Amino acid sequence: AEVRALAKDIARLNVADNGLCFGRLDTLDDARLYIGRLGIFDRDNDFEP
Amino acid sequence: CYGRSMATGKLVDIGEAVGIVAAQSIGEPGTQLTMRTFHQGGVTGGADIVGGLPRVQELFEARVPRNKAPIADVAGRVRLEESDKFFKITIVPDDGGEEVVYDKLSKRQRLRVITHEDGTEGVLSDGDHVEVGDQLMEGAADPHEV
Amino acid sequence: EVIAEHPVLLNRAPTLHRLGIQAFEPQLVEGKAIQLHPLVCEAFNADFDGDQMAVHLPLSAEAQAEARILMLSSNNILSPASGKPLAMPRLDMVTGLY
Amino acid sequence: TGPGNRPLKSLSDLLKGKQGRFRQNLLGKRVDYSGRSVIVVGPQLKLH
Amino acid sequence: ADVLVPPQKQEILERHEAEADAIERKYQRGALNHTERNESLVKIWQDATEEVGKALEEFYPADNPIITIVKSGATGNLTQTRTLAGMKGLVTNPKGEFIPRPIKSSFREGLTVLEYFINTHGARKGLADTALRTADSGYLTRRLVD
Amino acid sequence: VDLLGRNKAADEAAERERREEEAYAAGVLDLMVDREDLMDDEDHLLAQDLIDAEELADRFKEQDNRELSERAAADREWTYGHVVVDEAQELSEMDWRL
Amino acid sequence: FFDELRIGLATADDIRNWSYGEVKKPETINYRTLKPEKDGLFCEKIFGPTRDWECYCGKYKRVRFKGIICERCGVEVTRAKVRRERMGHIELA
Amino acid sequence: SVPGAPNRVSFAKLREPLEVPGLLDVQTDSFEWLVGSDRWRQAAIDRGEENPVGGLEEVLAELSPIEDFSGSMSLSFSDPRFDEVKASVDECKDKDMTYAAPLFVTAEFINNNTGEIKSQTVFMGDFPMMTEKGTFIINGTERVVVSQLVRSPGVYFDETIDKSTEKTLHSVKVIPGRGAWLEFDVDKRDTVGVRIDRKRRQPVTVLLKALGWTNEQIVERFGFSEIMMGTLEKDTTSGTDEALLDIYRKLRPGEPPTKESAQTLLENLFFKEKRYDLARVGRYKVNKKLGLNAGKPITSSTLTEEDVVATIEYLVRLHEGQTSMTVPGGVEVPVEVDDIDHFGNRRLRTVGELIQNQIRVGLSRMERVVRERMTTQDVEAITPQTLINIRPVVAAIKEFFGTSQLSQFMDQNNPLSGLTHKRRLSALGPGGLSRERAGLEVRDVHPSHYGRMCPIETPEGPNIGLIGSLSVYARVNPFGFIETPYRKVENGVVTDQIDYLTADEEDRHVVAQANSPTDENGRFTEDRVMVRKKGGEVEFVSADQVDYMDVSPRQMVSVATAMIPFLEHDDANRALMGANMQRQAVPLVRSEAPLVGTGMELRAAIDAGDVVVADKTGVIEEVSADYITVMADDGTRQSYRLRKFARSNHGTCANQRPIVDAGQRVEAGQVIADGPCTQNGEMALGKNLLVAIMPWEGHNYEDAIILSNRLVEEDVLTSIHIEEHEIDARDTKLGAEEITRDIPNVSDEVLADLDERGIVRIGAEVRDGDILVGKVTPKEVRDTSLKVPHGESGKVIGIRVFSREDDDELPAGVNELVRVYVAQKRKISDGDKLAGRHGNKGVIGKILPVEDMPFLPDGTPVDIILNTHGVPRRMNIGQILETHLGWVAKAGWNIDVAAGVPDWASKLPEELYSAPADSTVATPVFDGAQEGELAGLLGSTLPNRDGEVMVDADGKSTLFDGRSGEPFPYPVTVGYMYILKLHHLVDDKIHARSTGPYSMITQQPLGGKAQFGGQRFGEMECWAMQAYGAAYTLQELLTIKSDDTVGRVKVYEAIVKGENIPEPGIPESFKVLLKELQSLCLNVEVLSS
Ligand SMILES: [Mg+2]
Ligand SMILES: [Zn+2]
């Protein structure tokens, strides 16, 4: 189970290596939302995307 | 040529069936290796790295690897171009006089990495020097090409 | 009289390597369980929680010589796969020496 | 074919078929002068 | 008396629990997919299990019999010691996936009903897995012998 | 292709290869220890109880896993989930039929 | 002991030498008291005693006649079930 | 609830809202339904079921009427009646008879040509009956019919990955109780096809037209999906007649069609009840899915065109990826795949239903013969008796209880073994599954098993996962689905209302854990609660988001699992091992209830049925070792016969001993005699032994166990084993076999024990080869006496003889039959397997003298020594918990409550504040002695006779070395543990062979201990010998010892004559090959080089 989970994570990261970020969205509240192939979150900041 | 016998610690004797010993020694620990999923359905588990018993089966049967990595036919200098999903690598041989091209290398497979002692040269890139039989793409080289 | 110095082959299936069969010198014992040396268990992959073992009797002089020379347990201390010691202290012995 | 819908045997089939010697059985034999019993720890025994 | 429980096991867990909460929070806002949320929870709880194991190793005296057996090379692993006196950790679905809810209890403390029920899955799966692995091992061994 | 149809030939060679692989897998299974001869402390699941010869033989085949972009483009009879046509006015009626 | 094994193509003389007698009668066994026919596929004088120690005419039935030839039958009654290992030949026109 | 149970203080902190039901109700209720008993009828009519119908009534109503082509003759059946049983259970088991009752049904014949009726009672045969113990007695033996798990009839949708294109494809199949299958699917080319009765695949539109649909109706009902329109437009068939003809051709190839049969074939195939039905459970399932026939009750059991159309629409909607579907006029329902492993789909064929199906087959044969022989008799005189043939029905019943997999010999190893056998759920058997079907997948534990099938119990052998055990609180629906009880919960307060939910019902709600902290009225104290969600996902939810709660923590476990103390401290693997080992503990001469156990031993022992329970209140009148007399207060007198030294199916002793004395007053339901493994009415599968946890000189290395000689001297682990030897005398082509005291060419001393009949006298000691009964046969006679097999011995305790001269019902050809019973006391010996309840098992490696064992400071020697290295790596630390508590139970405790109760004792019920020595305690599996409570109780133990405490607060005691005499340098854990003597004795595992019988099919030594065979020398053993380079030994093994007959005999003679063994060579099987090669004119020659 652990080996397969880690292998799946590695393969997903390798696939996402090419063209990580598609674009950006500006919200009417003046926020920013980055759209890409992977979900990257700041584990040190309450997992803010 | 065979040399010291592992069981007796002395030079192998004439007539010893080293072949069966090697077969048993390689096969007995096979149960410790990772294997293909035993679930009947689902997607192919070989898409993710499963390099355990299946890899040994592939090697001993001399079958073409799934993630085949082309090898350099000639030593020289590498010049590299990239596209949306394909690489276009070429080797210019220093002592040779003809460019050797690899034109259909998918980008879903990564390039080779050097990891030099102190230069930290990292991934293969234009201008690097490659010897004969070096792997250009990160993966598994085909035994027949070698 | 007849059992003295007559080797017997002990085997435990499945036999995954040559050290799954080994020659031993018998000793008549009271009871009906086979007394196995603690050190060879790793070779046999045996645990005394109900495991059984088979015994074979070489008859011819050549077979007896082979059992006494090639197959005797004291001559197979090292594993053939890697040469590491196999008949070596385990479990209680390791903790005692430690 | 004659009696019943079975072809007549021939010498070559004695060599081809699983009967005879050439084609193995791949199954273990049962051997005389053999026994089987439960094992217990003989800590006092010598290695041999 | 000698199956010691590290005093830092209640803090570590709650700390990581907070992180888990945060993940669920981000999942409620739509910043996370279900599978990716489960992956994040699995990573967080793996980190928590590693921390609990380190704390258990630090706490135990050098002369404790339970740790003495493991450290002497006689039997077992620190993983088994953690499962006994630390926390059982993550368990797998019948389909092989990790269950994001860990078994925060330990066999020293005693598992709850649902923890035990979910633990039974992989326990029964291993019985068939071990039998199946021998088939592949024997296949490769017979090829090598031939 | 549709008007002429396929000759519906017989693939004897591949069938024989599959038969030989299945026979080898069955021999491998027969090579394992049977329930009657088990020496373990207690009865337990054996490989023969869970896997058949055909499954084991298939388990070791190459089982090519080409990508869809490769799998579909090489199959004249592939049915796609969606079709996009730019400059569609240029297609002939037969192209629309296809 | 032997070290090599060879197969050649036998000439008619070699086939003749291997044989103990001609199998001329195309019959296996009779019906009354199921006695094999003479010169048949189960003939006594070519292959040997029917099962053990009994010649075709029956006048020789004693285990002591290890090296005796029955005059009328010509059967060389012998131990070791020779008829399972002794073979014949057929001359074809 | 037991009036006269012994006291056993419990550590349980939760109050049980529901008591454990009758454990073996699954058998008794099912059989009572089958025969339509009065109790079953009263129970069912009170559930809401109107006009209940029994199984026999159901099959007879299905059978009747039986009519000819013209419809002039009719035959009907009604009122199945059962007479008194022919013989008592004891007499049935004595005379090899079947415990059966005559069955009578009234058959009415009607002849429309005259209108005259002729009713007549028809004897339908001797129906085997079920005892109060839930077993069937057949031919003197006791048998159990195990409940069978099967996929219930209905409609099942699935999606699978195409192995060619990797595409996902959807399919559906309609599974009826009987009749043709109907399947629909969407292929890799997005074409909807239908397979009728497993024939060739064809477009679904063909079937739709076959049902009378026109293109307009198809394009109206469908057309929401383009794939259906494509299939319709790409179909080469138009018209109902055209589709019916095509279906006829694809169902009945070659034969000429006709309009007369075009509609009739389909109508008979799928819609007429006499050939197709959903069995009233498929109908319910197909109504619940697809939202069809909602509201009104199930009226007809057959399929309908609406069902087919709804199935097609559901399949297409599922392929399109929709989640909600609404049939025109039906209720909206979800669109989803069906999990075949879910107990919402798997149902249970109980014993009654299996017997009913076999009766149905027999009645079908009877219907065929009746239909045949009405035409061959004068209609003006035919009567119900002449038409009826009861040979087929009795043949069917007799065959089901004989050569059937589900009817199995009762597991009489011990009472718990039989009790678990009765509550067994077998997935295999006729109609269950086959070797070609699911392996790994079907053996998994599914989330829906919770509270219905135990996730731990399963046989160790090839049936792991395929055979399970019913949970304690579970029960079967009339449809056969397993329900389990739950408490209602409202507004966050746990309500006392109990509802039996099926898995399908349970998936729709949220269920909270049993161990929910609640106030006095049931309000949850914690704001958050641990719950099970729909998909079997465990979650933490708000206290007000719960609909149901578990009645008890024992909900998910079965009897044997519930009998494991401190189960939650053991890993699932070792818990399974302990549960299975509890099932194979041999009864001991003296029984002893566990010192520390669960509150399950008493109820399990009473429900197993091996303890004699007083029928009604009374006064004991006369007690003997053979019978007990009770003078009831109602004036009736009861006499209970006790089984003494009776042989179990497995060869164990089934002695029953009274536990009451004359003049005692006994309440109804009180236990008056203990069974094989009970003390005072509760399980006593093992013995409580003083155990020290330590390695000892290596004699307990690798799980070996060291036993004190006391266990041999005091018969602590001694057992009684009884074996049965049978022999028959028959007719022959040359005469008959005769039995007499005379045997030719034998000594006068070998037949000394024989009596006038040539049978060994009772009480005679018999050993290997001793004559039991002498039998002489024609080749001037030949000796064929029965003799004791190799390695067997004992005392002759009983003889049973049956003879044809005395009208005994022996089988054809047999003239006489004799059975001799030999009993032996087996002491505990080296190699015998001992085990605890926590999966700790090992063989006895050494039995030390009493003075060699480590002994306590007062001089008490320990009884057993267990190695330390076994516990920590197996996560079965529960065995340690018990070891501590078992000590606190042996030596009473007294909590000091002077300055208030200690903090650790705040949860203990006041009854646990103190107890005397040799006290018994109860610790349920998931609610019992906590770690802190046990730690304090260890420090609150009473002093011994000398006024000192040996086991300290840590549970350890200073032990003196019995050999050297010096105290061990460190304290050792000492306690009392309950251990079992398992039925894996070395006495019947030692096997040896020098020479013996050979298989005439291959001339190799036979295989088997009872066949005196040889050990297998496998191919891997050949490889191992090859690796050694031991050519001579390998050749000797392969040639002399197995195959070569001439070499075999030659080597035997050489050994017995003291000359060196000769050289094998030129094998016979090589000579045959050489002669075959010569036959092909190949001059094969052996070269000397
Ligand atoms: Mg074992
Ligand atoms: Zn003669």
From Swiss-Prot, chain E:
S-S bridge residues: none
The organism's place on the tree of life at top rank: Bacteria
Transmembrane annotation, as ranges: none
Signal peptide region: none
Family label: Belongs to the RNA polymerase beta' chain family.
Main function: DNA-dependent RNA polymerase catalyzes the transcription of DNA into RNA using the four ribonucleoside triphosphates as substrates.
Subunit field text: The RNAP catalytic core consists of 2 alpha, 1 beta, 1 beta' and 1 omega subunit. When a sigma factor is associated with the core the holoenzyme is formed, which can initiate transcription.
Name listed for the protein in its UniProt record: DNA-directed RNA polymerase subunit beta'
Organism: Mycolicibacterium smegmatis (strain ATCC 700084 / mc(2)155) (Mycobacterium smegmatis)
Gene name of the encoded protein: rpoC
From Swiss-Prot, chain H:
Gene3D superfamilies recorded: 2.40.50.100, 2.40.50.150, 3.90.1100.10, DNA-directed RNA polymerase, beta subunit, external 1 domain, DNA-directed RNA polymerase, subunit 2, domain 6, RNA polymerase alpha subunit dimerisation domain, RNA polymerase Rpb2, domain 2
Keyword Repeat: no
HAMAP family: RNApol_bact_RpoB
Assembly with partners or alone: The RNAP catalytic core consists of 2 alpha, 1 beta, 1 beta' and 1 omega subunit. When a sigma factor is associated with the core the holoenzyme is formed, which can initiate transcription. Interacts with RbpA, which partially restores Rif-inhibited transcription.
Source species of the chain: Mycolicibacterium smegmatis (strain ATCC 700084 / mc(2)155) (Mycobacterium smegmatis)
GO CC, any one term: DNA-directed RNA polymerase complex
PANTHER family: DNA-DIRECTED RNA POLYMERASE I SUBUNIT 2
Enzymatic class: transferase
Protein name: DNA-directed RNA polymerase subunit beta
Gene assigned in the entry: rpoB
Impact upon substituting residue 421 to D/L/P/R/Y: Rifampicin (Rif) resistant
Superkingdom in the source lineage: Bacteria
Result after altering residue 408 to K/L: Rifampicin (Rif) resistant
Family recorded in the similarity comment: Belongs to the RNA polymerase beta chain family.
Catalysed reactions listed for this entry: RNA(n) + a ribonucleoside 5'-triphosphate = RNA(n+1) + diphosphate
